[PDB]
């Protein structure tokens, strides 16, 4: 099972930083009882010790934390109005300009690996990524929901 609800998708304005993104994406997870109440702080410190993915044309980050902080599997998606720098996950000096954020709150290791594999395929689909930057929240929710449905 993976919980993905319509309010788990949102657009974010141009004046948010890395920490505001994490907290904004975590708050719906917090409010539905999917993660521990301080889940956001643990994502921030795990990220500082990085989930930025340099892919064309849209940079992606996958912030998350230890499965022990997840109560029920969920995903929270954020579309950034302006690119925001995430440090490369591989360990390259240049920061990744990110516009799409997949917050992963997965507690089950087999789901984590399946979702990371699905994300890897998705972010190499340039038509899909372009669509993410122009669809509305409901359309994004329906598109990703269908893809999470096909995953399981």
């Amino acid at each position: 099972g993976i919980h993905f609800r319509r309010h788990y998708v949102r657009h974010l304005p141009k004046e948010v930083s890395q920490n505001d993104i994490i907290k904004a994406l975590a708050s719906p997870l917090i409010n539905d009882g999917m993660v521990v109440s301080d889940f956001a702080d643990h994502v921030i410190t795990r990220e500082q010790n990085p989930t930025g993915l340099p892919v064309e044309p849209v940079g992606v980050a996958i912030p998350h934390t230890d499965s022990k902080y997840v109560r029920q599997n969920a995903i929270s998606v954020g579309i950034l109005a302006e690119p925001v720098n995430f440090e490369d996950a591989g360990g390259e000096p240049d920061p990744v300009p990110v516009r799409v954020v997949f917050m992963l709150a997965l507690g089950n290791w087999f789901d984590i690996t399946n979702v990371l594999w699905w994300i890897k395929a998705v972010i190499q689909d340039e038509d899909f990524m372009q669509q993410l930057l122009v669809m509305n929240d409901d359309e994004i929710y329906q598109s990703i929901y269908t893809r999470i449905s096909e995953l399981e």
Partner: antibody
Amino acid sequence: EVQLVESGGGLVKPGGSLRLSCSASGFDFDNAWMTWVRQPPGKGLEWVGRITGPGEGWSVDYAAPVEGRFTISRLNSINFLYLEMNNLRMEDSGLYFCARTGKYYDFWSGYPPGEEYFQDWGRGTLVTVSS
Amino acid sequence: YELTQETGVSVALGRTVTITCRGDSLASHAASWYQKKPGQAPILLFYGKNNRPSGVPDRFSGSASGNRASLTISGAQAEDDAEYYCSSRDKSGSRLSVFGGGTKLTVLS
């Protein structure tokens, strides 16, 4: 600082049953995956089975020569891992090790479900199945 | 065996030696490597792409390509005389694990 103290090994008859125990200490056991591995006398290591954590519902996977006869369980309150062995056979004889089990998945090169690796081992407890 | 290892290899003191693990599941899954001496608990030597547990000597290194995993020991020391085991999935996408048959490393001591 990790210790994994297996016990319960001994002489048992073919067709009999035996329970092995492993007392774990020095790490967060509630969230750890745990594996049993055996070594028949004179042979190599053989993976027996592994029990997952709470996020996986404590699900268990077993090797083919053992599935349907062995049961792996755990009691997190006392940091114990168990191996219940039924309908034992001569070829089940050997040294049984518990192993703290880590999980690995490389984003760009990985394939589900990643890989498990065995980061801490006990010394093992010896099982001898004989008539 | 899903994972095939050489049975035995020799190396003079201070030489480099490589031992290998081969199987179809290695094209999809990294191998991990273990050292075991007579009468003693195995120890993990490394795992994943470029990961080595703290305390494991720098001279133990691993590589991988295609269906092949390799453990390379630089200047072999006397205490490296041991059995070496690789582990990975038994098949691609499997939840089970499996060990290779093990390699006896003799360090000409």
